[PDB]
Design a protein around this ligand. Structure first.
Ligand SMILES: *[C@@H]1O[C@H](CO)[C@@H](O[C@@H]2O[C@H](CO)[C@@H](O[C@H]3O[C@H](CO)[C@@H](O[C@@H]4O[C@H](CO)[C@@H](O[C@@H]5O[C@H](CO)[C@@H](OC6O[C@H](CO)[C@@H](O)[C@H](O)[C@@H]6O)[C@H](O)[C@@H]5O)[C@H](O)[C@@H]4O)[C@H](O)[C@@H]3O)[C@H](O)[C@H]2NC(C)=O)[C@H](O)[C@H]1NC(C)=O
Ligand SMILES: *[C@@H]1O[C@H](CO)[C@@H](O[C@@H]2O[C@H](CO)[C@@H](O[C@H]3O[C@H](CO[C@@H]4O[C@H](CO)[C@@H](O)[C@H](O)[C@@H]4O)[C@@H](O[C@@H]4O[C@H](CO)[C@@H](O)[C@H](O)[C@@H]4O)[C@H](O)[C@@H]3O)[C@H](O)[C@H]2NC(C)=O)[C@H](O)[C@H]1NC(C)=O
Ligand SMILES: *[C@@H]1O[C@H](CO)[C@@H](O[C@@H]2O[C@H](CO)[C@@H](O)[C@H](O)[C@H]2NC(C)=O)[C@H](O)[C@H]1NC(C)=O
Ligand code: DIF
Ligand code: FE
Ligand code: ZN
Ligand code: ZN
Length: 341
């Protein structure tokens, strides 16, 4: 049989991947790139097999021919008799979060404020909110909407990167990988928590997972849910308990992608790997946990219960949903067809 070559984005993911590789007895090995797009390119070249992707990245990967293989499944809201691997996924809720103390800030007063985004091209952090903003403003100048932002992946000298902080050494400012302090769900939420930005574009889970003791991180350990509010599209503000009635969109879950000709093998290997290292896997937590990384969401989101089988052998467009695909396409007209590589 063949090894599966995972692609890790940045050095922290690479360290975790290397641990996984060792524990997997080399059934999984690691390639690494500086950005998700570069990992997608390694896979396109056949120099890596697979990685787990946010839905926007799935769009990029899908235009280039890669296919969804298995999806992140978090704990469900409702009892299900089904095994996690066979439980239909529920998408996650993309939200716009602000501080309660920032009174009078609403969806309709976002112009000229400071924003924190997971990364350019990601679902909750970018495609959904910027797509909505472009539409409502009738303008493609989304790079001039917020006074300053951290939007990892943007031009580092631009306003879209002005709030990004890079690493310990201040290096890698605005890179779209975990070195950047404010990268990803957790980074963008931290950007809001520290009042670097006025608004964070993340998902509902992020708020809950980093407040009220759920995170022991120095920056998060003392945060309280009641100190945050969600911005609803109708211009109201709601407590973070009201995400189901105050979100920007329902996002398709992050999912593993690969070339078609490697998909069945990547799938088989991952199903076995999670049986070993997944949530209440045979050798997790004793040996290694594939879905933990000290609330850093490395390789997979830390709230992943399992990678689940897809229904109906879906194309990337079916997986993302026609709604979301068209929204991405419309936004991309600002900055239809074909691989971006
Ligand atoms: C924003 O993001 C947040 C972070 O992810 C989300 O919060 C997380 O949400 C999950 C669940 O959705 C939450 O859940 C965990 O909770 C427990 C462990 O704490 C887990 O175990 C349970 O699973 C069972 C199945 O769903 C449930 O068991 C019961 O339900 C029945 C029926 O109601 C009851 O039985 C009865 O009692 C009533 C009384 O009259 C009677 O009707 C009946 O006759 C019946 O006999 C029992 O009371 C019992 O509750 C139980 O609900 C629970 O789900 C669960 O699966 C998860 O592990 C996480 O704790 C939570 N995380 C944090 C940090 O808070 C938000 O949900 C999300 N918001 C939105 C809107 O999406
Ligand atoms: C920014 O603004 C943009 C411009 O409006 C937004 O893009 C547009 O988004 C719309 C919503 O996605 C498109 O509308 C489409 O809606 C139709 C119906 O879709 C279905 O849902 C029903 C009900 O569940 C189902 O039956 C079905 O399975 C679909 O899921 C589309 O389809 C039609 O199909 C039916 C039969 O199924 C048929 O009767 C019709 O003839 C028709 O073919 C329809 O074709 C639409 O695409 C808009 O087209 C789209 N506009 C543009 C210009 O592209 C964008 O979302 C905004 N961005 C954000 C972030 O909000
Ligand atoms: C690495 O992968 C190999 C191949 O799938 C695994 O070995 C297989 O294990 C299953 C269960 O033991 C057996 O049915 C097969 O016969 C084995 N195949 C071969 C050729 O060895 C192995 O368990 C995996 N190891 C880890 C740690 O992931
Ligand atoms: O119309 C479509 O193409 C897809 C569609 C419509 C309504 C509800 C869900 C979905 N698709 C969908 C699928 Cl099939 C998987 C994961 C996430 C999503 Cl949003
Ligand atoms: Fe996402
Ligand atoms: Zn909704
Ligand atoms: Zn299909």
């Amino acid at each position: 049989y063949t090894r599966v070559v995972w692609c890790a984005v940045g050095p922290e993911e690479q360290k975790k991947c290397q641990q996984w590789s060792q524990q997997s007895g080399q059934n999984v090995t690691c390639a690494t790139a500086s950005t998700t797009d570069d990992c997608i390119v390694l896979v396109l070249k056949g120099e890596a097999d697979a990685l787990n992707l946010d839905g926007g990245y799935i769009y990029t990967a899908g235009k280039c021919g890669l296919v969804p293989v298995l999806a992140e499944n978090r704990k469900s809201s409702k009892h299900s008799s089904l095994d996690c691997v066979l439980r239909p996924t529920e998408g996650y809720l993309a939200v716009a979060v602000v501080k309660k103390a920032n009174e009078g800030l609403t969806w309709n007063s976002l112009k000229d404020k400071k924003s924190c985004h997971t990364a350019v091209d990601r679902t909750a952090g970018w495609n959904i909110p910027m797509g909505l903003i472009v539409n409502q403003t009738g303008s493609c100048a989304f790079d001039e909407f917020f006074s300053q932002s951290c939007a990892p992946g943007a031009d580092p000298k631009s306003r879209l990167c002005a709030l990004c902080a890079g690493d310990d050494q201040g290096l890698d400012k605005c890179v779209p990988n975990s070195k950047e302090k404010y990268y990803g769900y957790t980074g963008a939420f931290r950007c809001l928590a520290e009042d670097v930005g006025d608004v964070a574009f993340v998902k509902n889970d992020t708020v809950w997972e980093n407040t009220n003791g759920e995170s022991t991180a120095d920056w998060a350990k003392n945060l309280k849910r009641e100190d945050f509010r969600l911005l609803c599209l109708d211009g109201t503000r709601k407590p973070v308990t009201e995400a189901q009635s105050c979100h920007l969109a329902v996002a398709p879950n992050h999912a593993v992608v690969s070339r078609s000709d490697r998909a069945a093998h990547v799938e088989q290997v991952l199903l076995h790997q999670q049986a070993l290292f997944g949530k209440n896997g045979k050798n997790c937590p004793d040996k290694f946990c594939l879905f933990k990384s000290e609330t850093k969401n490395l390789l997979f989101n830390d709230n992943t219960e399992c990678l689940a089988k897809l229904g109906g052998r879906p194309t990337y467009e079916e997986y993302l949903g026609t709604e979301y695909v068209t929204a991405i396409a419309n936004l991309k007209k600002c900055s239809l067809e074909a691989c971006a590589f």
